[PDB]
Amino acid sequence: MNIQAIDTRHGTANQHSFSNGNCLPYTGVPFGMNFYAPQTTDQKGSWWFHPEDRTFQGYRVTHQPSPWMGDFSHLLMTPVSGSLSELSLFHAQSSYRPEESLFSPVEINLTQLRYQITSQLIPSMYGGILTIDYQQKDNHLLLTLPGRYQVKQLDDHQVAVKVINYSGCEDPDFSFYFVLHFEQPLTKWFAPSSGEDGKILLSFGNIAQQVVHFSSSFISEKQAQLNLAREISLRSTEMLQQGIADWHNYFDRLKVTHENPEHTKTFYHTLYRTFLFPQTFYELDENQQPIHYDTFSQTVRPGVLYTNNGFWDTYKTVYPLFSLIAQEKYEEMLEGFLNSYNETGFLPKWLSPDERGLMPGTLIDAVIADAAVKKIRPDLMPQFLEAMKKGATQQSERENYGRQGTLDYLKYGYVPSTYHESVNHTLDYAYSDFCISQVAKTLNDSETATFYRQQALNYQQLFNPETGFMQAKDTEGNFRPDFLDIRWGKDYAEGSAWQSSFAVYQDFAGLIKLYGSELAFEKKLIQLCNQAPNFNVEGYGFEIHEMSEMAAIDFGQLAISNQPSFHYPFLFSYIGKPEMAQPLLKQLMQTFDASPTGYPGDEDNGSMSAWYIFNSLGFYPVTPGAGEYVIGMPLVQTAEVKLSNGKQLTIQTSPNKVQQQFIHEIQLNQEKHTAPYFTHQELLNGGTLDYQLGIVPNPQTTAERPFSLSTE
């Protein structure tokens, strides 16, 4: 699909009570430092765009990764004609016709009906071009400068802005610089000024067209001018062509077809949302050297940096996909994450722009371990191992950094029930421990590998054989009483015991053994899938959108709306019955489409999009750090995968219509493939992956299982 046909309102029909992706209509280049979106309202907090709104407040320069994190370093540009007494966004707002507008990754185009203005925004990595066609005779641009600001007019054609605004930041004066060069001159001079919540009306007089070339920096005004100078001569058409080529660089890596072209349209909308985050958070100085802002020291520091990622989300799918098709980005992003550790003392958890904490666990450890076992940035793994061992043995004095209950986990073999969400923290630390063991192993560090492989079995501490769930346990080894399987919160993050008891990616064979047999585990998985989607709210005291998104559909406790359930269909692969889940995977993929209601829950910065992309191809990374993809059920008929190593994997299915719900046979390079997984090395060899599909199952009788520590 051509990037210009992607409609960025995909996944944007949201509110606090219910998510269909909690996406914004992000216009930008891949991993752009800024994104650009129309703002329709200032009365709904983080939900400042809705696709059903007919009001246009301005073009918002945004860094907002999710409505839960909020924005940082934002401002707006609003074309205006005529006089305004009052310059508030509400007083300057115009209606617009969404159905006559363009909402695409490389271009916004819309008409303000109040002003008879039609305008076009094209993005670049650090800036963009805003072209403004005025019908009226007194023409302006309104800059909305939230928080503390500075603005000045440098000459007739140049304006410089600084704004300080954020939702959370270690630097209370966190500054963003924004520079505008106008083709047509300013007709009114104003003196340098500063204040809070700026409303600056720039005047151009009677011109038919203004062309605004803009750039930005987290370094300085002078760096923002250097970023602008590098692209000032571009016409809007040339910047648009370059942005189309940037997106085609990534889209061209996965050329797919389907029986149903609606499925292809869904694929490419999720692929657009897979190359946005993490956002570039470094600039190139006068010597082309990477520099960035370090909010911990409040200084400019050398090196790459990336932002807008919660590894709790993105470790699941994003970095594994990048390990196949965007290794050059993974390489640079790992360098940035290590820089975050260098600057703060702890490997990052939730960057927006700097450490926000929020979710349980230190899942950066899986991003690191997956890279180590795939030979990505082996040069950094000794530095990563030191950072990981520090996070596993030392408690940050600051609540947002590293492990919570670090020392209690080491004393007891679990985080005790007095900690919030102790089941998640326990299971995430045991999985982290596996990840640390894998990095150690790649470095031939036997003592570290042995100790952390043993720590990785700590999931066993919270398994209650009386219930068949993971439950919180106090310091005397007693399970919290009054257990209810469907009760959300308190001991579990955004789920019940059903959404939390299977986070054992390092050792499913060992978890299965705790149930007593492959058959007792099978019965538990069947009950999870086939029951009603009932929930109890008591751990929260009210219903949250994750509950509502599970209860909106009849897929039992398999809450595909949120990350904890993403791997659930693959649990059948660990008992040698993947055929039980092949229909279920195709039916789960039908919960996605390219519409404004197109995701089953929060998309989370590529996480759910890459879930869809992997499942479309028919395999999935259940265990980052194992170097394997567990086989599912493909939705494509064809795929040409351009691998980062320069080879090509060509996928071909037999006719893949709605009645094909099973895999009959797989050939990899014309050889029968019976294992319920692929190694990373097998896929990197490239060649041909042929799926013969079925309308009935074809049970394989093989003892082969995907990776588990306890059986390796």
Ligand X SMILES: OC[C@H]1O[C@H](O)[C@@H](O)[C@@H](O)[C@@H]1O
Which residues are at the interface with ligand X (CB under 6 A)?
A: 66, 68-69, 310, 312-313, 358-359, 494, 562-563, 602, 604
Nearer to Na ion, 2 or 587 (CB): 587
Radius of gyration of the chain (CA): 26
Under 8 Å between Cβ of 64 and 44: no
| Binding partner of residue 545 among ligand 5II, Na ion, ligand X, none, CB cut-off 5 to 8 Å per kind | ligand 5II
Say if CB 698 and CB 665 are below 8 A apart.
yes
Q: Is 138 exposed, middle or buried (0-12, 13-18, 19+ CB in 10 A)?
A: middle
Span of 260-268, 374-382, 529-537, 544-552 interacting with ligand 5II by CB under 6 A: 544-552
562 binds Na ion (CB under 5 A): no
Taking CB under 5 A as the binding criterion, the range among 18-26, 51-59, 365-373, 521-529 that sits at the site for Na ion is: 18-26
3-class state of residue 233 by DSSP: coil
Stretch of 133-141, 261-269, 298-306, 538-546 contacting ligand 5II, by CB under 6 A: 538-546
Q: Which is nearer to Ca ion, 365 or 602 (CB)?
A: 602
First-to-last CA distance in the chain? Answer: 42
> Smaller CB distance to ligand X: residue 312 or 319?
312
Confirm if 65 and 352 have CB atoms less than 8 A apart: yes
Q: Give me the sign of the Cα torsion angle 19, 20, 23, 24.
A: negative
Angle at the Cα of 317 (from 641 to 341), degrees rounded to 5? 120
DSSP for 636-655 reads -SEEEEE-TTS-EEEEEES-
Q: How far is the CB of 489 from ligand 5II (least distance, A)?
A: 8
Q: CB of 494: closest distance to ligand 5II in angstroms?
A: 6
Query: How far apart are CB 688 and Ca ion at their closest, in Å?
Result: 36
Q: Which residue is nearest to ligand X (CB)?
A: 66
For ligand 5II, the binding residue among 84, 544, 553, 668 (CB under 6 A) is 544
Q: Which does 20 bind (CB under 5 to 8 A by kind): Ca ion, Na ion, ligand 5II, none?
A: Na ion
| 170 in contact with Ca ion (CB under 5 A) | no
Q: Is 552 in the site for ligand 5II (CB under 6 A)?
A: no
* 68 counts as binding ligand 5II under rule CB under 6 A: yes
Beta strands 176-182 and 536-539: pairing type?
Answer: unpaired
Task: Tell me: does residue 597 bind Na ion (CB under 5 A).
Answer: yes
By CB under 6 A, how many residues form the interface with ligand 5II? 6
Using CA atoms, how far apart are residues 710 and 511, in angstroms rounded to an integer? 10
Say what the alpha-carbon torsion angle 174, 175, 176, 182 is, to the nearest 10 degrees: 160
Residue 676 neighbours by CB under 8 Å, 6+ apart: 573, 576, 578, 630, 631, 700, 702, 704, 705, 706
Q: How far apart are CA 268 and CA 568, in angstroms?
A: 24
Name the one range near Na ion by CB under 5 A: 20-28, 581-589, 619-627, 695-703: 20-28
Among 363-371, 377-385, 411-419, 543-551, the segment contacting ligand 5II (CB under 6 A): 543-551
- Which window, 78-86, 110-118, 363-371, 541-549, contacts ligand 5II (CB under 6 A)? 541-549
Q: Are 31 and 314 in contact (CB under 8 A)?
A: no
Instruction: Choose the one of ligand X, ligand 5II, Ca ion, none that binds residue 119, judging by a C-beta under 5 to 8 angstroms depending on kind.
Output: none
Among 487, 545, 680, 705, binds ligand 5II (CB under 6 A): 545
Dihedrals phi, psi of 511, to nearest 5 degrees: -65, -40
Burial class of residue 87, CB neighbours in 10 A (0-12, 13-18, 19+)? middle
Min separation Cβ 572 and ligand X, Å? 25
Least distance to ligand X, CB of residue 377, Å: 24
Closest CA to 424 of 467, 373, 380, 472: 472
| Contact track, Ca ion, 463-482, x by CB under 5 A | --------------------
Q: How far apart are CA 313 and CA 493, in angstroms?
A: 13
Q: Footprint of ligand 5II on residues 470-509 (CB under 6 A)? A: 494
The answer, yes or no, to whether the previous bond of 699 is cis (omega within 30 of 0) is no
User: Pairing mode, if any, of strands 107-112 and 102-104?
Assistant: antiparallel
DSSP letter string over 433-494? HHHHHHHHHHTT-HHHHHHHHHHGGGGGGGEETTTTEE--B-TTSPBPSS--TTEEETTSSS
Site string for ligand 5II, 569-608 (x = CB under 6 A): ---------------------------------x------
What is the nearest approach in angstroms of ligand 5II to the Cβ of residue 141? 35
313 binds, among ligand X, ligand 5II, Na ion, none (CB under 5 to 8 A by kind): ligand X
What span, in angstroms and rounded, lies between the C-alpha atoms of 313 and 310? 6
Amino acid at site 74: H
628-631: strand order across its sheet: 619-620, 628-631, 677-679
Distance of closest approach, residue 549 Cβ to ligand X, in angstroms: 10
Choice from 71, 421, 546, 593 touching ligand 5II (CB under 6 A): 546
Quick check: 20 binds Na ion (CB under 5 A)?
yes
Q: Which is nearer to ligand 5II, 108 or 472 (CB)?
A: 472
- Number of Cβ within 10 Å of residue 459's Cβ equals 29
Convert 221-231 to b/e letters by CB count within 10 Å (16 or more is b): bebbbbbbeeb
C-beta of 239 vs 364, nearer to ligand 5II = 364
Min dist. Cβ of residue 568 to Ca ion (A): 15
> Smallest distance from the beta carbon of 296 to ligand 5II, in angstroms?
23
Cα 493 from chain centre: 18
Q: From Ca ion, ligand 5II, ligand X, none, which one binds at residue 544 (CB under 5 to 8 Å depending on kind)? A: ligand 5II
Q: What is the C-alpha separation between 707 and 628, in angstroms, rounded?
A: 8
Q: Which is nearer to Ca ion, 218 or 312 (CB)?
A: 312
Rounded distance, CA 446 to CA 444, Å?
6
343 binds, among ligand 5II, Ca ion, Na ion, none (CB under 5 to 8 A by kind): none
Which residue number is nearest to ligand 5II in terms of Cβ?
68
Residue 614's identity, in one-letter code, is: F
Cβ 371 vs Cβ 319: under 8 Å: yes
**562 makes contact with Ca ion (CB under 5 A):** yes
Nearer to ligand X, 251 or 350 (CB): 350
d(CA 712, CA 708): 6
CB of 315 to ligand X, least distance (A): 11
Q: Which is nearer to ligand X, 309 or 644 (CB)?
A: 309
Q: Nearest 5°: phi and psi at 151?
A: -145, 145
597 binds, options ligand 5II, Ca ion, Na ion, none, Cβ within 5 to 8 A by partner type? Na ion
Binding mask 593-622 for Ca ion (x = CB under 5 A): ---------x-x------------------
Residues of this chain that interact with Na ion (CB under 5 A) are 20, 597
Residues of this chain that interact with ligand 5II (CB under 6 A) are 68, 494, 544-546, 602
Residues of this chain that interact with Ca ion (CB under 5 A) are 562, 602, 604
